[PDB]
Each structure stands twice: as structure tokens, then as C-alpha cells.
Amino acid sequence: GDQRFGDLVFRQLAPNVWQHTSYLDMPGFGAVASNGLIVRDGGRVLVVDTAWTDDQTAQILNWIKQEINLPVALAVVTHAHQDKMGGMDALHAAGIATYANALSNQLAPQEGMVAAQHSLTFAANGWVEPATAPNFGPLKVFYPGPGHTSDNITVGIDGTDIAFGGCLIKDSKAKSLGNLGDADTEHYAASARAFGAAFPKASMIVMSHSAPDSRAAITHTARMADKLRLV
Ligand SMILES: [Zn+2]
Ligand SMILES: [Zn+2]
Numbered sequence: 001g002d003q004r005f006g007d008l009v010f011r012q013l014a015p016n017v018w019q020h021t022s023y024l025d026m027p028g029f030g031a032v033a034s035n036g037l038i039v040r041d042g043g044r045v046l047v048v049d050t051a052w053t054d055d056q057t058a059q060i061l062n063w064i065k066q067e068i069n070l071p072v073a074l075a076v077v078t079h080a081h082q083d084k085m086g087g088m089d090a091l092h093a094a095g096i097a098t099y100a101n102a103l104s105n106q107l108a109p110q111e112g113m114v115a116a117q118h119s120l121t122f123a124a125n126g127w128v129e130p131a132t133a134p135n136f137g138p139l140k141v142f143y144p145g146p147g148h149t150s151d152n153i154t155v156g157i158d159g160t161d162i163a164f165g166g167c168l169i170k171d172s173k174a175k176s177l178g179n180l181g182d183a184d185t186e187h188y189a190a191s192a193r194a195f196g197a198a199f200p201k202a203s204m205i206v207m208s209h210s211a212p213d214s215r216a217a218i219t220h221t222a223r224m225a226d227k228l229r230l231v
Contacts, residue, residue: 006059008051010067014160016040019206020060022051024083034083034208036060037164039157040068041137047075047096048139048155048164049208050087057087061094072096076139077116078166079152080107081182083208088114099133101143103151120153126194142198144168146184147191147225148177156199163202165195165217171210172220177228178209189225192218 002011002021009021017039024032036049038060045064050057064072074097077085085108091098092114100108102119109115120141121129128141138158146152148167156163169192170178177183184191196218205217 005063008056008059008063010038010063013037013162013204013206013212014157017157017160017162019212020047020049020051020063022053022056022060022083024052032083032209035206036084036208037155037157037162037206038064038068039138040070041073043070044073044137045070046137046139047072047091049077049084049166050075050091052083052086054087054090054093057090058094060087061090061096073135074099076100076120076136076141076153076155077104078154078164078208079149080104080111080113081149081167081179082112084166085111085113085116088116092117101151101153104153107149107151126198140199142195144194144198145187145191147188148179149182150184152191154195154198156202161201161203162206162212163195163199163204164206165192165208165221167208168192168195169205169207169217169221170224171207171213172216174210174220174224177221177224180228185225185229189222189229192222192225196222 098116100116
């Protein structure tokens with residue numbers, strides 16, 4: 001089901017959801033994949049996560065114009081690292097409203113990222129404060145606690161079986177938790193568990209650095225994180 005468009009790959013996940021994949025192209029690194037989502041919400045399109053670069057993000061927008069041909073109403077980015085927020089300038093040049101956790105926007109200058117235009121804030125139970133996420137349609141945004149980074153957020157797609165863990169969740173056969181440089185090793189397992197409990201009916205778990213998996217991705221990630229905490 002994958003389809004290559006320029007240097008990107010797109011895979012349809014549901015009648016109105018696609019995963020976008022872009023690859024890092026930097027002179028001393030391998031071709032590291034990062035996945036985000038495209039959601040068609042009736043007469044508009046919603047994007048979760050940029051690509052690694054502005055030019056890759058413009059190619060996502062070009063695929064949307066060709067294959068869907070509806071305006072992109074907003075994008076949500078899941079934490080302040082290059083794979084999720086590296087293409088913010090391309091979204092703003094296209095007139096697309098951008099949203100991120102306040103804490104992602106605070107961290108963005110230190111991380112080399114351009115901040116989103118709007119800041120999301122969260123209740124004590126992890127759910128997004130609705131007034132900060134107006135007109136998000138089927139996107140249900142949840143902050144599960146610190147894990148892969150202090151700011152990482154997750155997104156369920158109402159009307160589908162899909163929930164997106166971003167860089168917090170790894171697939172059920174992952175050998176490690178990946179990029180831990182910014183990670184909260186004490187709370188990571190409970191944050192992975194909180195993601196699972198926030199979207200308890202989701203059967204397709206989408207994540208940044210693995211292909212879509214079953215809910216076993218969630219329990220495997222929480223186990224890896226508990227091992228690491230115990231070491
Ligand atoms: Zn990251
Ligand atoms: Zn990542």
C-alpha cells in the first residue's frame with residue numbers, strides 16, 4: 001500500500017486518513033524515516049506533524065493539492081524536534097494555522113525550531129483544553145506525560161480506529177526506545193500507558209519511526225521503558 005511521490009512516501013490508512021513519511025537527508029546520517037498523518041475532515045484537510053525540512057513539507061502540501069484538492073485548515077505538531085517541526089516555515093508560507101503544546105513552543109527556539117502560531121494547553125487529566133484547540137474536528141489531542149520528550153503529545157482520530165503516538169510509541173518488535181537524548185526515563189512507561197488508556201478502543205497505532213502496529217506496540221514500549229528505569 002505504500003506510494004512514492006517525489007522523495008516522500010504516502011500510505012492510506014482509512015478512507016480519510018493517510019500516513020506521510022519523509023527521510024532525513026544530511027551528509028553524515030542514514031536515511032531516517034519519520035511518519036505523520038493527513039486527515040480529510042469533510043471539506044478540509046488537517047495535518048499532524050511536518051516533515052524534516054521545509055522543502056519536504058511543501059511536497060506534502062503538493063501531494064494534498066493533487067490527490068485531495070481541499071484546503072489545509074490547520075496542522076498540529078507533536079513535539080519540538082526536527083522530524084515533527086522542521087517544516088513549520090512551509091506551513092506558514094502556505095497560510096496554514098499551526099498548533100503545538102505551549103511547552104513545545106517554549107522549547108522551540110532552544111531546539112532550532114520555528115514556534116507554532118498557537119499554543120495548546122492541557123487539563124490535569126491530560127486532555128487538551130478545548131478553547132485552545134478550536135475547530136479540530138475529529139482530532140482528539142492528549143498529553144500523556146513526559147516520555148520521549150517533556151512536551152510530546154498524541155492524537156486520536158474520531159470515527160476511525162487510529163491513534164497516533166508520535167515518537168513516544170515504538171513498534172512491538174523495536175529493539176530500543178530510539179532517540180532518548182531528551183527523554184524522561186522515570187515517567188516514560190506511565191506516559192506510554194496513559195496514551196493507551198486515553199484511546200482504549202484504537203486498534204491501529206501509528207507512530208513516527210515504525211510502521212502502523214497493533215496495541216502490542218503500546219505494551220512493548222511501556223515494558224522497554226520500565227526496563228530502562230530499573231537498570
Ligand atoms: Zn523526537
Ligand atoms: Zn522522532
